[PDB]
Design a protein around this motif. Structure first.
Motif, PDB file in Angstrom:
ATOM      1  N   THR A  97       0.829  -1.202   0.000  1.00  0.00           N
ATOM      2  CA  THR A  97       0.000   0.000   0.000  1.00  0.00           C
ATOM      3  C   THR A  97       0.866   1.256   0.000  1.00  0.00           C
ATOM      4  O   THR A  97       0.450   2.310  -0.480  1.00  0.00           O
ATOM      5  CB  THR A  97      -0.951   0.040   1.212  1.00  0.00           C
ATOM      6  N   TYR A  99       1.676   2.795   2.596  1.00  0.00           N
ATOM      7  CA  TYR A  99       1.224   3.614   3.721  1.00  0.00           C
ATOM      8  C   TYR A  99       2.271   3.738   4.820  1.00  0.00           C
ATOM      9  O   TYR A  99       3.038   2.809   5.070  1.00  0.00           O
ATOM     10  CB  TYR A  99      -0.056   3.034   4.323  1.00  0.00           C
ATOM     11  N   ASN A 148     -11.844  -4.302   3.126  1.00  0.00           N
ATOM     12  CA  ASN A 148     -12.944  -4.845   2.329  1.00  0.00           C
ATOM     13  C   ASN A 148     -14.145  -3.905   2.249  1.00  0.00           C
ATOM     14  O   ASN A 148     -15.034  -4.091   1.421  1.00  0.00           O
ATOM     15  CB  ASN A 148     -13.391  -6.192   2.898  1.00  0.00           C
ATOM     16  N   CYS A 149     -14.162  -2.895   3.112  1.00  0.00           N
ATOM     17  CA  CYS A 149     -15.289  -1.991   3.210  1.00  0.00           C
ATOM     18  C   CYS A 149     -15.126  -0.838   2.236  1.00  0.00           C
ATOM     19  O   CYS A 149     -16.064  -0.195   1.761  1.00  0.00           O
ATOM     20  CB  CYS A 149     -15.462  -1.387   4.606  1.00  0.00           C
ATOM     21  N   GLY A 150     -13.864  -0.566   1.932  1.00  0.00           N
ATOM     22  CA  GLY A 150     -13.513   0.548   1.075  1.00  0.00           C
ATOM     23  C   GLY A 150     -12.055   0.912   1.249  1.00  0.00           C
ATOM     24  O   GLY A 150     -11.248   0.075   1.647  1.00  0.00           O
ATOM     25  N   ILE A 151     -11.712   2.162   0.967  1.00  0.00           N
ATOM     26  CA  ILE A 151     -10.316   2.575   1.024  1.00  0.00           C
ATOM     27  C   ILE A 151     -10.002   3.300   2.325  1.00  0.00           C
ATOM     28  O   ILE A 151     -10.525   4.378   2.602  1.00  0.00           O
ATOM     29  CB  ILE A 151      -9.949   3.461  -0.172  1.00  0.00           C
ATOM     30  N   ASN A 176     -14.382   8.026   1.790  1.00  0.00           N
ATOM     31  CA  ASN A 176     -15.714   8.617   1.669  1.00  0.00           C
ATOM     32  C   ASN A 176     -16.721   8.065   2.680  1.00  0.00           C
ATOM     33  O   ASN A 176     -16.441   7.100   3.395  1.00  0.00           O
ATOM     34  CB  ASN A 176     -16.255   8.454   0.238  1.00  0.00           C
ATOM     35  N   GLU A 178     -19.688   6.580   2.229  1.00  0.00           N
ATOM     36  CA  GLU A 178     -20.351   5.326   1.887  1.00  0.00           C
ATOM     37  C   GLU A 178     -19.575   4.121   2.407  1.00  0.00           C
ATOM     38  O   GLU A 178     -20.169   3.134   2.832  1.00  0.00           O
ATOM     39  CB  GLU A 178     -20.544   5.220   0.371  1.00  0.00           C
ATOM     40  N   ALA A 179     -18.248   4.208   2.375  1.00  0.00           N
ATOM     41  CA  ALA A 179     -17.405   3.138   2.894  1.00  0.00           C
ATOM     42  C   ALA A 179     -17.570   3.015   4.402  1.00  0.00           C
ATOM     43  O   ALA A 179     -17.624   1.909   4.938  1.00  0.00           O
ATOM     44  CB  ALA A 179     -15.947   3.381   2.539  1.00  0.00           C
TER      45      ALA A 179
END
Lengths: 205, 207
Positions: A97, A99, A148-151, A176, A178-179
């Motif tokens: 990643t 990160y 898995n939910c988003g970024i 965001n 929505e995640a």
């Protein structure tokens, strides 16, 4: 090896011989430099009961200081209190990643910001609270779960500076809203460990 | 029913009445607006024989126009092909919602991200890209994206398409945010049996 050049400086300063020898061992390890220990930190160390000081320096020498960008402020954090994860999983995660991982006495922060992030931070609308985390768990297991939910924009596992374990909760910011909602919907009451169910709450309802 | 207010505009432009009729019918469906098509596309359409123009419009009508930002270029793509089906939308909607990535569809390509939202600085480039071949022709990015997401962070994904059939060309490129992710994808996903009996061919773009 012999004592470092800063050893007699510690003794001159009035540190107990035992405390000075332990700090000098830390110096020779490379965990800390004498050039980054201010007179304030030495005074605080001097104010400690001897066996108290030995324990603090002992905990410091025997702690995972990887990804700790401020060893000096870390030791000071350990002193105020008295007053890790699978390294190869972590390595693979950080490699793929890119990160940052930064560890302080009370927190292990993943990302925040991610590499190459443009503009404002997502804020608390995109953040979730993750409670009831098993104390033995670290971000090596938490990160793949929330990916898995988003970024993930950041993930902050709150740590117990005394126990060494986590404080049982963390915050996760996604890029965001929505995640974040996605994480609440799918991971609330998730049995991450046998008998252990997470508590996921949106930070801003 | 009655015809739209752009119908006589098409006739004024010199379009054959039958062609203008079909085009105006496409207007009605909402798949296309008169404002969207520019004069370059109409001229190209006018040069077509009536039988040929009508089928170009027919193929356009039957095309998956979801996530097509440039309808004019899409129409022109169909025309250039003539002189010579899609993802589970519920899956796509979820993916796009959770990542915020753009999805742009052309006659020859379906593009995911590139760049991602809020990307600052240098693009990853070819050094962070992998080639993904032997993709089943019926597969779309709704299945390809979750596959490569396990490897690292996708910067973009480009599924190459056959404008003749509307199915993929059997290959795609995936760019990750660093090379470690790309190398990881090659190592773990080369010869991946993505469907029974169908194994992917993953190669690093820059060896």
């Amino acid at each position: 090896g012999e004592r470092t050049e800063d050893y007699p400086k510690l003794l001159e300063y009035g540190l107990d011989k035992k405390v000075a020898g332990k700090l000098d061992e830390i110096y020779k390890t490379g965990k800390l430099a004498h050039a980054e220990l201010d007179e304030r930190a030495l005074d605080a160390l001097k104010e400690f009961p001897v066996d108290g000081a030995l324990n603090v320096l002992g905990q410091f020498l025997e702690s995972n200081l990887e990804h700790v960008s401020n060893k000096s402020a870390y030791l000071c954090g350990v002193m105020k209190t008295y007053r890790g994860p699978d390294e190869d999983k972590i390595k693979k995660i950080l490699e793929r990643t890119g990160y940052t991982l930064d560890v302080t006495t009370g927190q292990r922060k993943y990302g925040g910001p991610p590499p190459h992030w443009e503009g404002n931070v997502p804020g608390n609308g995109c953040e979730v609270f993750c409670g009831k985390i098993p104390k033995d768990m670290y971000e090596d297991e938490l990160i793949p779960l929330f990916e898995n939910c988003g970024i993930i924009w950041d993930l902050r596992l709150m740590m117990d500076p005394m126990t060494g374990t986590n404080r049982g909760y963390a915050f996760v910011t996604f890029t965001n809203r929505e995640a974040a909602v996605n994480a609440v919907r799918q991971l609330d009451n998730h049995e991450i460990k046998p008998g252990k169910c997470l508590k996921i709450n949106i930070s801003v309802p």
